[PDB]
Design an enzyme around this catalytic site. Structure first.
Site, PDB file in Angstrom:
ATOM      1  N   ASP A  55      10.815  -3.833  19.996  1.00  0.00           N
ATOM      2  CA  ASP A  55      11.372  -4.333  21.245  1.00  0.00           C
ATOM      3  C   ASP A  55      12.746  -5.017  21.024  1.00  0.00           C
ATOM      4  O   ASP A  55      12.913  -6.202  21.225  1.00  0.00           O
ATOM      5  CB  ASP A  55      10.343  -5.274  21.886  1.00  0.00           C
ATOM      6  CG  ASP A  55      10.813  -5.850  23.191  1.00  0.00           C
ATOM      7  OD1 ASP A  55      11.597  -5.183  23.912  1.00  0.00           O
ATOM      8  OD2 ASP A  55      10.398  -6.995  23.486  1.00  0.00           O
TER       9      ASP A  55
ATOM     10  N   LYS B 293       0.873  -1.137   0.000  1.00  0.00           N
ATOM     11  CA  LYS B 293       0.000   0.000   0.000  1.00  0.00           C
ATOM     12  C   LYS B 293       0.921   1.200   0.000  1.00  0.00           C
ATOM     13  O   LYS B 293       1.830   1.296   0.839  1.00  0.00           O
ATOM     14  CB  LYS B 293      -0.864  -0.054   1.253  1.00  0.00           C
ATOM     15  CG  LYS B 293      -1.355   1.285   1.776  1.00  0.00           C
ATOM     16  CD  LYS B 293      -2.313   1.944   0.810  1.00  0.00           C
ATOM     17  CE  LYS B 293      -2.564   3.379   1.182  1.00  0.00           C
ATOM     18  NZ  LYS B 293      -3.117   4.241   0.107  1.00  0.00           N
TER      19      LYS B 293
ATOM     20  N   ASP C  68       6.958   7.199  -7.585  1.00  0.00           N
ATOM     21  CA  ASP C  68       5.902   8.249  -7.423  1.00  0.00           C
ATOM     22  C   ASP C  68       6.240   9.630  -7.973  1.00  0.00           C
ATOM     23  O   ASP C  68       5.554  10.619  -7.676  1.00  0.00           O
ATOM     24  CB  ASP C  68       5.415   8.367  -5.962  1.00  0.00           C
ATOM     25  CG  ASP C  68       4.531   7.176  -5.539  1.00  0.00           C
ATOM     26  OD1 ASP C  68       4.151   6.344  -6.436  1.00  0.00           O
ATOM     27  OD2 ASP C  68       4.219   7.073  -4.308  1.00  0.00           O
TER      28      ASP C  68
ATOM     29  N   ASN D 277       9.968   6.232  -0.634  1.00  0.00           N
ATOM     30  CA  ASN D 277       9.958   6.349  -2.099  1.00  0.00           C
ATOM     31  C   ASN D 277      11.265   5.895  -2.722  1.00  0.00           C
ATOM     32  O   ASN D 277      11.445   5.940  -3.925  1.00  0.00           O
ATOM     33  CB  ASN D 277       9.642   7.783  -2.530  1.00  0.00           C
ATOM     34  CG  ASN D 277       8.203   8.171  -2.226  1.00  0.00           C
ATOM     35  OD1 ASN D 277       7.270   7.367  -2.428  1.00  0.00           O
ATOM     36  ND2 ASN D 277       8.015   9.392  -1.725  1.00  0.00           N
TER      37      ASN D 277
ATOM     38  N   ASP E  87       7.078  15.021  -2.764  1.00  0.00           N
ATOM     39  CA  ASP E  87       6.818  14.190  -1.613  1.00  0.00           C
ATOM     40  C   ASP E  87       7.888  13.163  -1.439  1.00  0.00           C
ATOM     41  O   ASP E  87       7.645  12.000  -1.105  1.00  0.00           O
ATOM     42  CB  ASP E  87       5.465  13.510  -1.788  1.00  0.00           C
ATOM     43  CG  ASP E  87       4.329  14.495  -1.829  1.00  0.00           C
ATOM     44  OD1 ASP E  87       4.338  15.429  -0.985  1.00  0.00           O
ATOM     45  OD2 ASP E  87       3.436  14.310  -2.697  1.00  0.00           O
TER      46      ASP E  87
ATOM     47  N   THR F 209       5.651  11.891   6.866  1.00  0.00           N
ATOM     48  CA  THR F 209       5.682  12.829   5.735  1.00  0.00           C
ATOM     49  C   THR F 209       6.264  14.200   6.133  1.00  0.00           C
ATOM     50  O   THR F 209       6.966  14.850   5.347  1.00  0.00           O
ATOM     51  CB  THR F 209       4.266  13.035   5.104  1.00  0.00           C
ATOM     52  OG1 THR F 209       3.322  13.555   6.052  1.00  0.00           O
ATOM     53  CG2 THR F 209       3.725  11.746   4.557  1.00  0.00           C
TER      54      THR F 209
ATOM     55  N   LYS G  60      10.729  11.024   0.062  1.00  0.00           N
ATOM     56  CA  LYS G  60      11.033  10.504   1.390  1.00  0.00           C
ATOM     57  C   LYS G  60      11.585   9.082   1.275  1.00  0.00           C
ATOM     58  O   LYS G  60      11.554   8.484   0.188  1.00  0.00           O
ATOM     59  CB  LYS G  60       9.812  10.570   2.302  1.00  0.00           C
ATOM     60  CG  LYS G  60       8.627   9.727   1.885  1.00  0.00           C
ATOM     61  CD  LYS G  60       7.375  10.273   2.549  1.00  0.00           C
ATOM     62  CE  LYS G  60       6.135   9.599   1.988  1.00  0.00           C
ATOM     63  NZ  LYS G  60       5.863   9.944   0.557  1.00  0.00           N
TER      64      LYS G  60
ATOM     65  N   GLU H 281      -1.463  -6.317  26.032  1.00  0.00           N
ATOM     66  CA  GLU H 281      -1.970  -5.040  26.574  1.00  0.00           C
ATOM     67  C   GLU H 281      -1.988  -3.924  25.526  1.00  0.00           C
ATOM     68  O   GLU H 281      -2.982  -3.194  25.406  1.00  0.00           O
ATOM     69  CB  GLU H 281      -1.170  -4.642  27.826  1.00  0.00           C
ATOM     70  CG  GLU H 281      -1.497  -5.513  29.051  1.00  0.00           C
ATOM     71  CD  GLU H 281      -0.372  -5.643  30.095  1.00  0.00           C
ATOM     72  OE1 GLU H 281       0.750  -5.136  29.923  1.00  0.00           O
ATOM     73  OE2 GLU H 281      -0.585  -6.295  31.136  1.00  0.00           O
TER      74      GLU H 281
HETATM   75  C1  LIG Z   1       4.350   7.460 -12.345  1.00  0.00           C
HETATM   76  C2  LIG Z   1       4.611   6.010 -11.865  1.00  0.00           C
HETATM   77  O1  LIG Z   1       3.324   5.613 -11.360  1.00  0.00           O
HETATM   78  C3  LIG Z   1       3.493   4.490 -10.637  1.00  0.00           C
HETATM   79  C4  LIG Z   1       3.069   3.274 -11.132  1.00  0.00           C
HETATM   80  C5  LIG Z   1       3.247   2.142 -10.354  1.00  0.00           C
HETATM   81  C6  LIG Z   1       3.846   2.225  -9.100  1.00  0.00           C
HETATM   82  C7  LIG Z   1       4.046   1.095  -8.312  1.00  0.00           C
HETATM   83  C8  LIG Z   1       4.667   1.208  -7.078  1.00  0.00           C
HETATM   84  C9  LIG Z   1       4.973   0.201  -6.160  1.00  0.00           C
HETATM   85  N1  LIG Z   1       4.603   0.169  -4.876  1.00  0.00           N
HETATM   86  N2  LIG Z   1       5.090  -0.815  -4.324  1.00  0.00           N
HETATM   87  C10 LIG Z   1       4.805  -1.132  -2.936  1.00  0.00           C
HETATM   88  C11 LIG Z   1       5.764  -0.443  -1.979  1.00  0.00           C
HETATM   89  C12 LIG Z   1       5.678  -1.145  -0.622  1.00  0.00           C
HETATM   90  C13 LIG Z   1       6.549  -0.411   0.351  1.00  0.00           C
HETATM   91  N3  LIG Z   1       6.009   0.951   0.540  1.00  0.00           N
HETATM   92  C14 LIG Z   1       6.155   1.711  -0.735  1.00  0.00           C
HETATM   93  C15 LIG Z   1       5.345   1.025  -1.852  1.00  0.00           C
HETATM   94  C16 LIG Z   1       5.850  -1.542  -5.134  1.00  0.00           C
HETATM   95  N4  LIG Z   1       6.579  -2.667  -4.980  1.00  0.00           N
HETATM   96  C17 LIG Z   1       7.265  -3.175  -5.997  1.00  0.00           C
HETATM   97  N5  LIG Z   1       7.264  -2.564  -7.163  1.00  0.00           N
HETATM   98  C18 LIG Z   1       6.550  -1.433  -7.376  1.00  0.00           C
HETATM   99  N6  LIG Z   1       6.580  -0.850  -8.550  1.00  0.00           N
HETATM  100  C19 LIG Z   1       5.823  -0.887  -6.349  1.00  0.00           C
HETATM  101  C20 LIG Z   1       5.041   2.456  -6.671  1.00  0.00           C
HETATM  102  C21 LIG Z   1       4.855   3.579  -7.452  1.00  0.00           C
HETATM  103  C22 LIG Z   1       4.257   3.461  -8.659  1.00  0.00           C
HETATM  104  C23 LIG Z   1       4.095   4.591  -9.395  1.00  0.00           C
END
Ligand SMILES: CCOc1ccc2cc(-c3nn(CC4CCNCC4)c4ncnc(N)c34)ccc2c1
Length: 459
Positions: free
Chosen positions: A403, A17, A153, A137, A132, A172, A134, A448
């Protein structure tokens, strides 16, 4: 003949996500090519630009190629979503790789930052801003030690309005440039974010910090930071100089990405051979591991509560759907009807094929199988327990990882840090604790903590 995403791709599994929606590992139905697809739900994410502007950006993004920028292959749109199809990378988030190392030097940080600046430089030449940027990304191409960095992204922020849900905006605030907060920004905001990231790599602490989102933003907007942490004494003067230039308040005075690439520090510490003076930044790596564990636990806690609220919603909705489908009144339903209501619940399940198989995993899971007449009540319990698994299991994992001394417990000081990062009001969480364990002495075990989270989401 406008093409259709699910005609070309089948969903294999959820990758994660991210910003603006889910990322799904997908597979071309003909060529077998695997791809990572970001699915943006039009209902959850409002557009800032018009269609024409978004399609032109997409068309440009497809034509750019750089070793440090995620490659985009394809773009689709239907009634309900947007689908962005990119290359899949398997190395995970950079910082999660970094914390697994036992050695980390200015050479390692300059290798890292050089890639980032090289990708940013290229994108800015093509007038695309991230905004954005970070640690999340920054993905690693593969699990190999020598793996390239791929920025994800780039350009989406311009066209889609970011989630205001805390579960989506954790961590963020540390990275955003001050001019972004005020509304007039340009490509120099990406240099500032990069500057913050570099500060963290060499010290393991954010330059702008505080107990909650809003305190961090108050610090960013003022723009003041320092190098008086003890672990800066181990760092070259050259690195600090680059940092000051990246963290310059007024954007017109801040160094460009391109110029940052040429800075003495990058030129010196990326020469593969010369180790003229290269100690390991031991304190930094341990600060980063603490920083990361804190961020991950706060995130997992929010998603735990979110999943618990979803399961309340969907349990009741599914039951009412099945009840009305039950024309007998006997409480039983066949497979197709279970599939029909579960699809009706609809609105990872990208086609009808995905739904039927989830239902089949549950009908197999229904322990032992009589075919024809199925007790709708029990299917509901099992379908929903399934949905929460990933998030409770992940919660325990994150608790255990936070932990680090294996004490089995987290202190109230630690809870304050976690709940500040999760943006749960102070008075609220203590009232909750008081009710879970009326005798506690400033610490909670996993059970807890979990009980606390349940109370904080109205259970
Ligand atoms: C203008 C380009 O438009 C696009 C289109 C597809 C894209 C797919 C991914 C992508 N996400 N994740 C899961 C990560 C899990 C860890 N936290 C961060 C995300 C991914 N894991 C593996 N591969 C990936 N390509 C992603 C991220 C950005 C994208 C942007």
């Amino acid at each position: 003949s406008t093409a259709i995403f699910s005609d070309r791709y089948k969903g294999q599994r959820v990758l994660g996500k991210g910003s603006f929606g889910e990322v799904i590992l997908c597979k071309d139905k003909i060529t077998g090519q695997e791809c990572a697809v970001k699915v943006i739900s039009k209902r959850q994410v409002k557009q800032k630009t018009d269609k024409e502007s978004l399609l032109r950006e997409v068309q440009l993004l497809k034509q750019l190629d750089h070793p440090n920028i995620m490659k985009l292959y394809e773009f689709f749109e239907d009634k309900g979503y947007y689908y962005l199809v990119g290359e899949v990378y398997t190395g995970g988030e950079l910082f999660d790789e970094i914390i697994s190392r036992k050695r980390f030097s200015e050479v390692d940080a300059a290798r890292i930052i050089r890639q980032v600046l090289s990708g940013i430089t290229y994108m800015h030449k093509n007038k695309i801003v991230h905004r954005d940027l970070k640690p999340e990304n920054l993905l690693l191409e593969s699990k190999s030690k020598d793996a390239n960095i791929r920025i994800i992204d780039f350009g989406l922020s311009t066209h889609f309005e970011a989630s205001k849900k805390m579960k989506d905006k954790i961590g963020t605030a540390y990275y955003i440039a001050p001019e972004v907060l005020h509304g007039t920004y340009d490509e120099k905001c990406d240099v500032w974010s990069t500057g913050v990231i570099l500060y963290i790599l060499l010290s393991g602490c954010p330059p702008f910090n505080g107990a909650n989102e809003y305190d961090i933003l108050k610090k960013v907007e003022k723009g003041k930071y320092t190098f008086e942490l003890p672990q800066w004494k181990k760092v070259s003067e050259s690195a600090k100089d680059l940092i000051r230039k990246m963290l310059t308040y007024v954007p017109s005075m801040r160094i460009s990405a391109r110029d940052a690439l040429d800075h003495e520090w990058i030129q010196t510490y990326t020469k593969e051979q010369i180790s003229v003076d290269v100690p390991s930044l031991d304190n930094a790596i341990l600060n980063i591991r603490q920083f990361q564990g804190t961020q991950k636990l706060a995130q997992a806690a929010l998603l735990y509560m979110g999943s618990k609220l979803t399961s309340q919603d969907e349990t009741k909705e599914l039951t009412a759907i099945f009840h009305k489908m039950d024309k007998n009144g006997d409480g039983q339903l066949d497979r197709a009807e279970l599939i029909e209501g579960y699809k009706e619940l609809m609105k990872s399940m990208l086609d009808a094929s995905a739904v039927e198989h989830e239902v089949d995993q549950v009908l197999d899971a229904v322990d032992f199988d009589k075919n024809g007449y199925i007790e709708y009540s029990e299917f509901v319990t099992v379908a929903m327990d399934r949905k929460t698994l990933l998030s409770r299991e992940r919660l325990e994992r994150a608790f255990r990882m936070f932990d680090s001394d294996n004490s089995g417990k987290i202190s109230s000081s630690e809870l304050a840090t976690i709940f500040g990062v999760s943006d749960v009001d102070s008075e609220t969480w203590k009232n909750v604790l008081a009710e879970v364990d009326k005798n506690n002495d400033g610490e909670v075990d996993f059970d807890e903590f979990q009980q606390m989270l349940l109370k904080l989401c109205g259970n």
